[PDB]
């Protein structure tokens, strides 16, 4: 170690015995603090490196490497933290620790020592255009194994050994948060690194994330029936299957049969499993008429035709092999696919298998979009690069007995399966948890990315597995949310708090307290609720402010 003085500009510079050998410092300066932005708490003094991991040429004759920026506080209190990914990753942060929940005060903000990393690829680098732009990653076999854990295991070995020469120790305890990929990274981490990090948040994981295209060829072929107009490739318009006043009239439907079996009619479906059970856009009425929500004759604004009923009837099912057997898993019907705040139609739910409406082409996530061409490249293996204009057919023309068996193939050079490297469905978390290590999921009830009862299944695998699960591991569901954010719900929460609290004091979180972001949803200027860990659901107390989170309690269903 350099005969320096700790946590300082000298021993900030001097980083320029790294456990990987192939380990190149590229930037290592000392920052004065940086006062607060409209977007940003303030920014303590620190030391910020970058640089870059395992430089080298990949068998698609394109470079890559891992790159990690990490921000090391001059006042520092011990702890380090490392921010989750998100889409197909490939782009590195500001790396000042996010903590997601839309929070404005970041790890460092908090004094945390903080790193982010791309994932292995990098966006502006990796972009071939015969390969479906950046998700063209794909096509290199050690590139799928950095995205899916040798990243993160990497950057997590070199932040901490940068920690213990730059600050003279280890840091006490190691936190991870984050959500979508991020979210699957956190799963990754508890089963596949235990020792890595003491506390972990992982929000809507997509630990099955090579499901997801599955899932997305089943979607777009159950909305095609209800599809009007063609894009330019000739392929329906998802998008116009149905508008947004439509699916605003699907909502509404929805609050009316379920709203009120959480005890209080407020716009929120608290009670998520008696809705399941009850809800059926067959059969359910339009609340404000008592005429059925399926158009018994011509369509109205004030219907959804039977094509269009049968057509979200058979997305939310899940998708199914010609032997009738789940290939992923199905989706809860909820108040959040759609929502008004004003004049603003909520498009949260609807981007992910629908796109916007006010469209000539197709723009969903999953018919065209990054979703439909990840799965293409990066999970289908060997993987399939083809034109963007194909993408769509591509989905169209998706067969459920032949194509989902891609994600669990090798082939050549691709040793593992998508699954094998990107998939976190492990429930043996006993070395984690005999270690002290503690983990927060949660996952927003109109989630259409990934399906927030696939993750309530997985916890209830992880319970059944492990007797006092919630000693360790508690699940937060969060009606109306959409992905990560946005929503008729309280989508706004501080997960890093209450992470510390249960990692370091052993209080383990029997509410978190949330707040809505577009409290518009409900026409109010504010609502806060308390999250409630998994199976329980928010219980109103019976009279006062039903915005205040003081008049209501966690409890079991009705
Ligand atoms: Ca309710």
Not at 102 to 117: C, E, V
Not at 240 to 266: N, P
Not at 367 to 382: N, Q
Request: proline share 7%; aromatic share 10%; charged share 15%.
């Amino acid at each position: 170690p350099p005969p320096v003085p700790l946590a300082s500009r000298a021993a900030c510079e001097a980083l320029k015995v790294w456990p990987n050998a192939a380990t190149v410092v590229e930037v290592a300066a000392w920052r004065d603090a940086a006062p607060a932005t409209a977007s940003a708490a303030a920014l303590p003094e620190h030391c910020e490196v970058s640089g870059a991991i395992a430089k080298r040429t990949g068998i698609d004759g394109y470079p890559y490497e891992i790159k990690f920026r990490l921000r090391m506080p001059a006042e520092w209190n011990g702890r380090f933290f490392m921010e989750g990914g998100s889409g197909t990753n490939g782009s590195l942060s500001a790396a000042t620790g996010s903590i997601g929940g839309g929070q404005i005060a970041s790890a460092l903000s908090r004094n945390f020592a903080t790193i982010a990393t791309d994932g292995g690829h990098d966006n502006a680098v990796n972009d071939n255009p015969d390969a479906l732009g950046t998700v063209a990653f794909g096509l290199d076999p050690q590139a799928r194994l950095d995205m899916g854990y040798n990243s993160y295991d990497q950057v997590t070995q070199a932040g901490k050994a940068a920690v213990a020469r730059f600050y003279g120790r280890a840091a006490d305890k190691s936190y991870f948060i984050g959500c979508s990929e991020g979210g699957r990274e956190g799963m990754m981490l508890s089963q596949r690194f235990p020792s890595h990090y003491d506390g972990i948040v992982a929000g809507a994981p997509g630990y099955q994330l090579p499901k997801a295209g599955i899932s997305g060829a089943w979607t777009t072929q159950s909305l095609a029936p209800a599809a009007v107009g063609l894009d330019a490739q000739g392929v329906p318009l998802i998008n116009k299957s149905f508008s947004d006043a439509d699916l605003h009239l699907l909502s509404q439907a929805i609050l009316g049969t379920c709203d009120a079996l959480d005890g209080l009619a407020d716009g929120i479906v608290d009670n998520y499993r008696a809705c399941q059970a009850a809800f059926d856009p067959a059969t359910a009425a339009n609340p404000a008429n008592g005429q059925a929500l399926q158009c018994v004759g011509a369509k109205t604004a004030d219907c959804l035709s039977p094509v269009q009923v049968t057509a979200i009837k058979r997305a939310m099912a899940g998708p199914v092999n010609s032997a009738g057997t789940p290939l992923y898993n199905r989706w809860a019907w909820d108040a959040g696919m759609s929502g008004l705040s004003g004049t603003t139609y909520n498009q949260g739910w609807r981007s992910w298998w629908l796109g916007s409406f006010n469209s000539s082409a197709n723009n969903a996530q999953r018919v065209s979009g990054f979703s439909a061409r990840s799965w293409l490249v990066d999970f289908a293996t060997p993987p399939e690069p083809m034109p963007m204009t194909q993408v769509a057919a591509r989905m169209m023309k998706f067969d459920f007995d032949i194509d989902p068996l891609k994600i669990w193939a090798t082939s050549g050079q691709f040793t593992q399966s998508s699954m094998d490297w990107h998939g976190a469905t492990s429930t043996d978390l006993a070395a984690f948890r005999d270690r002290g290590g503690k983990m927060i999921l949660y996952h927003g009830m109109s989630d259409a990315a990934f399906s927030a009862l696939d993750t309530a299944d997985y916890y209830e695998r992880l319970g059944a597995a492990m007797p006092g699960a919630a000693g360790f591991a508690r699940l937060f569901l969060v009606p109306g949310m959409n992905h990560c954010s946005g929503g008729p719900g309280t989508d706004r929460f501080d997960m890093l708090t209450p992470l510390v609290a249960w990692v370091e004091r052993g209080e383990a979180p029997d509410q978190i307290s949330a707040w809505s972001g577009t409290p518009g949803y409900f026409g109010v200027a504010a609502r806060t609720r308390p999250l409630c860990p998994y199976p329980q659901i928010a219980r109103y107390k019976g009279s006062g402010d039903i915005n205040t989170e003081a008049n209501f309690a966690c409890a079991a269903p009705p």
